[PDB]
Design a protein around this ligand. Structure first.
Ligand SMILES: CC(=O)N[C@H]1[C@@H](OP(=O)(O)OP(=O)(O)OC[C@H]2O[C@@H](n3ccc(=O)[nH]c3=O)[C@H](O)[C@@H]2O)O[C@H](CO)[C@@H](O)[C@@H]1O
Ligand SMILES: CC(=O)N[C@H]1[C@@H](OP(=O)(O)OP(=O)(O)OC[C@H]2O[C@@H](n3ccc(=O)[nH]c3=O)[C@H](O)[C@@H]2O)O[C@H](CO)[C@@H](O)[C@@H]1O
Ligand SMILES: CC(=O)N[C@H]1[C@@H](OP(=O)(O)OP(=O)(O)OC[C@H]2O[C@@H](n3ccc(=O)[nH]c3=O)[C@H](O)[C@@H]2O)O[C@H](CO)[C@@H](O)[C@@H]1O
Lengths: 478, 478, 478
């Protein structure tokens, strides 16, 4: 942050990713609310290289679209190079180069589409070191407890880099090496072209190994330079779903920490999932088993969770959102939502409103200070202020009617009222318990439909004789 | 996988397990859906020894039954040796031997009933090494950060094994040894009998230590061989509930990983509990706070969780099961269940069906494409296809009547309908909101019981004067 | 446990705690159900020093009250020293000394208000070592992977302590030191006064560093002694919310372990939060995603969770409390609560009672063997024994009426009954489904209000023509 020039970045993304066992292209799997690809491109764009090229393989029609979207989001131009068949990483670099002017003179940085955690600094350091050491190729390495599967970096006691050897081609002895190839490079474009031209597919994998390039350039008498990255997580890639979840977990730790340091109490970081676009205000407390997803925004002094999932929800200041499942909705200041509350898209709850337990709202607006405390569904309706919706009620329209039920302010509807849409209820109106409202109700009016209660006096003895409820017999002689 | 012959396995399980502080025999505590005992016997049977014997103690009537069950499940014969009083591990081995022909000539492998994670390879390697080194006794060891409580393996600089010393009998110096006895052995039966005969109870515990046997056989000039196990977890035992939860956690990690590698996305492995018999199809996504228990089976391309608990539930392909608690039930392809949904035993939901929020179903069948979206209980009933059960409804029978309410296809029942079982509703029937159905309803018919809505016009002012709902007064002059 | 005399303890708590980014004083943030301050004072009081003094800063009116409360709770006297401005830790010690008689002769122990995990032993060892070594000052140290931010303890090869150097004032070389100052001290009061008098504010922070005192006393030719604490967590302090959550997590591990060792099965310790005052009986099983808060007490042989949150709830023996959110309530032996159940303050559920799914109770008593199984709200009411409250019902009073609805024993109320408070229902009474009870109901009586079901026979064809529910047409010709 930022890059020099002219710098061109290739992002290899044309591998089959068979180890994911997925019918969804590897780079499109997500963590923290962005696909791996989106993560990679966001970091790269922040460095603003002259050219940004994504090498894609056979399923490129499924991916190029996303790339164009990111191009626009990122305010820049991102090109696509094709590689019909995965003949190797080296071959992929060729294809990606084919999208540069044959006379390109800038540095060529190579990275992968499956390293979500890679950051601006690590890249900027990479090129900087590459220029300082006047290297023909610079390669990022890191050390792993288990180096299995990755390229072993061969050094002489000199610490001089000799070559990179793949897991498949390595000897048992070489496999003990725990310093591995990160797969992030900086090249002198001419040396890169030269070296690539000479690759051979005589491998355990019979492919064209981009990694062979550090060996040919050693042998060319060129400057070959490795650069160790300590924070190995930054350089970690995703080849299967085990590694996906580990990177997800690790990214999540960093996002949660940042929030904690900015004044957010997270009781249980290991159990609080927060996407990268989420914002949270000061002195807010998040309880365990909570996930805040998409573009969710929480104000200050809120209490969220436990066991709460919010996608693209906006929460004002001083609100409580407990054991709630919700998406695309707004909760105003000092509102109380939960526990056991479901908000569907389109829900807007005003300041000091209350959505209680076993309440669901979809596409509804609920005015300041209004309470829907119990066992109620509110669909496609607008409610006013300081009203009180009785328990066990339902606002529903049997459709595709786009007419909305309307309820005024200071209303008090009775337990078990069914509102058949579309209907209009006036300010300070009441409804009787067990009322079916099919007709508008005037301000100050009382709507009712329930019949009068009648008592059948010795009914249990007569029509349920001998039962335990022959405890009426006990009660009588007492 | 598999074993040589003749090989006889003793499983010591006759200890009191006092450190569990439980009124339930240690080996019967569970993890990942099997008792420790069931885990142990499953691994052993896979190796198919000639003889399999379980030594049990005083509460053997509570355990022998389970053993016979496992015998049948495992397709083999498992014997029981008794040890009335826990006089020691050595003594337990005697008792277990008493169930072999006095002239038994095979190798005797000894293991414990409290090591759930022990695997086939570790055992097969054990006997193999025992035969190769022509050992009189071979003993599995491993190294622990905290070796507290376990037998210290004493070696000379030779790496030669000299003896095993128990925590209780060890010196402060010996206690620093971090290589410990795993309690898994292979014996030459004759040397074992010989050695056991000579044990003495002159201990800190005043018991007959099976471990003394490696010392007497050293002194006998017999071949004594230790075999180190690196993956210490495999050899970890459960003596208290701290260790139980650690092994549970570790087993769970391995089960989740396997699923991830086979193409299942688990967002949060630390918070996803999956029993050993559960199956999950490709590209399925499991969200945090989910447990899949018993013989639950999930198809492909499903979304399960967050906060979902399924025991013996079957889920087709492309289904969503979110914030659901359920057991012994089936959810067909493309069905949507949750959030906040409860399925009790006997529930069968057809393809493309929907069980919504704050819905409970027990012992009911629900046809293809049928929706029960809100606040409804469906008990002991059968519903047809493409129907729509209105919110806030109840299907209940006041019993022990085994007659089932029946609802046809393309039905649309109105909000707040109570169905008193047993009743039959015909295809394309409707019910009015707030209807109590006690009588059959013919196809194409409309059932209703609710009264007409009536409005009492200035009622709030008259019977609740001065209230905030004197906002009718405001409304009138506006 | 216990302390010698005369021993005086100063608790520094007058720092601004800016790194918390909180409008709530650092020492008042909580973990495991106690503020850091309450944790600190509880441990100190258990040692019973002659004098206990808390140094507070500008917001002391917000804290001194809590201190007085703890004074009473702890059965002792705790004084407050003021320090108007945070001029440094050394300066804070002065202020705290100002609350001792000018001729005080006892030892002075200094500790911080932000070290929740500090235990009795570590303190008792501190003074004991201080007296043994006849030290003028003894200082607790510990070793950290990341020593960032803490005072580096400078030793000569002698292991002799030379000085403590702060992060801000340390050299890059000194910063590599990973042995750090714990900020827990024991002093000879005279040497302490002497040394403090000579402090200088010529610092990177330009403050009066209590830490300089170990240097002046070295230079005084006094005895200076460091004491290493291995369990670094005991000596860990909270300066930001990252460290808060880590200590919370670590404390929680220790509390859960203790319970496990006393015979409580916790399936998932990392996901089970248990406050310090909670009690749990033998053979109880706690499932993942559970938090037991405040003074919650669980009997024996219970099943609690998953996804259960209890604050100050009392649970008898053999009860199941599953996916329940509850506070200030009681659940009797063998009761079944959940899943998806909400208990508000004042709820008392008798033995063998059942609160089912999507049920909420507030301030209500529910007799032995009574069942409220589905979709019901029970507010401010008293129910008798072996009754059965039908699904989809509501007990609610439209208020501030303190009269309580009353229901007798062996009652069976029908699905969709609304009870308008206050009302009285007699033993063995029944209610019809869809009944609005506004009037008392006599024993053995049947209350009803619902109208008779009527059928409109070809209604779908007539008033919804062409619809899919023209499957009545199909049904007719079949
Ligand atoms: C380059 C090589 O020989 N091996 C390196 C490669 O191993 P590894 O075998 O992991 O390389 P992959 O097969 O993951 O591919 C690396 C990147 O190149 C892409 N790709 C691969 C082949 C292809 O024909 N087209 C294509 O675009 C992949 O989509 C991926 O984005 O990366 C590791 C870091 O994670 C390094 O330690 C290895 O030394
Ligand atoms: C055998 C011995 O002296 N000590 C070993 C024993 O310690 P440890 O003291 O853990 O042995 P336990 O008391 O757990 O018993 C070991 C096994 O033998 C059974 N049992 C024990 C006593 C008895 O009289 N009857 C009986 O059947 C127990 O149920 C258990 O299945 O196992 C440890 C491994 O976990 C080893 O490191 C110790 O060196
Ligand atoms: C004392 C000092 O120079 N540095 C020590 C201080 O660092 P550190 O910089 O962490 O010290 P803090 O600023 O946290 O304050 C330490 C304690 O003293 C209190 N306080 C501080 C300043 C003040 O003017 N008034 C006041 O009461 C704080 O509220 C806190 O309770 O504690 C660390 C342990 O956590 C040690 O490793 C450092 O060597």
């Amino acid at each position: 942050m930022t890059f020099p020039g002219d710098t061109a970045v290739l992002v290899l993304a044309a591998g089959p990713g068979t180890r994911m066992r997925s019918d969804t292209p590897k780079v499109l799997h997500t963590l923290a609310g962005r696909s791996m690809l989106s993560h990679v491109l966001h970091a790269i764009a922040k460095l603003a290289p002259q050219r940004l090229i994504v090498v894609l393989g056979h399923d490129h029609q499924r991916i190029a679209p996303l790339v164009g979207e990111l191009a626009d989001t990122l305010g820049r131009t991102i090109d696509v190079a094709l590689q019909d068949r995965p003949l190797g990483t080296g071959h992929a670099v060729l294809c990606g180069l084919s999208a540069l002017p044959d006379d390109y003179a800038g540095n060529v940085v190579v990275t992968s589409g499956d390293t979500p955690l890679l950051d601006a600094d690590t890249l900027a350091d990479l090129i900087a070191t590459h220029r300082a050491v006047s290297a023909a190729v610079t390669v990022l390495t890191t050390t792993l407890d288990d180096p299995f599967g990755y390229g072993r970096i061969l050094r002489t006691q000199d610490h001089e880099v000799m070559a990179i050897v793949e897991q498949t081609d390595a000897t048992p002895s070489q496999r003990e090496i725990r310093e591995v190839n990160a797969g992030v490079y900086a090249f002198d474009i001419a040396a890169l072209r030269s070296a690539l031209s000479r690759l051979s597919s005589n491998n355990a994998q019979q492919e064209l190994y981009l990694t062979d390039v550090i060996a040919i350039l050693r042998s060319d008498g060129q400057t070959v330079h490795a650069s160790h990255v300590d924070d190995s997580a930054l350089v970690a890639g995703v080849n299967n779903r085990v590694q996906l979840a580990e990177l997800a977990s690790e990214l999540n730790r960093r996002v949660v920490a940042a929030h904690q340091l900015a004044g957010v109490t997270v009781v249980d970081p290991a159990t609080t999932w927060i996407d990268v676009d989420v914002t949270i205000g000061r002195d807010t407390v998040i309880h365990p088993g909570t996930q805040l997803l998409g573009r969710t925004q929480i104000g200050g002094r809120c209490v969220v969770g436990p066991d709460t999932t919010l996608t693209d929800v906006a929460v004002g200041d001083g609100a409580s959102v407990v054991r709630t499942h919700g998406s695309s909705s707004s909760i105003g200041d000092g509102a109380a939502v939960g526990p056991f509350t479901y908000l569907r898209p389109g829900t807007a709850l005003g300041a000091d409103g209350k959505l209680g337990a076993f309440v669901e709202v979809k596409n509804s607006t609920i005015g300041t200070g209004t309470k829907v405390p119990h066992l109620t569904y509110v669909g496609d309706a607008d409610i006013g202020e300081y009203s009180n919706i009785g328990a066990s009620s339902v606002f529903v329209n049997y459709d595709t009617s786009k007419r909305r039920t309307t309820v005024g302010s200071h209303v008090r509807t009775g337990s078990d009222t069914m509102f058949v849409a579309p209907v209009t209820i006036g300010d300070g109106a009441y409804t009787g318990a067990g009322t079916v409202v099919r007709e508008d109700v005037p301000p100050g009016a009382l709507a009712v439909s329930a019949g009068p209660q009648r008592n059948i006096e010795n009914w249990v003895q007569r029509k349920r004789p001998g039962s335990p409820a022959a405890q009426a017999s006990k009660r009588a002689s007492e």
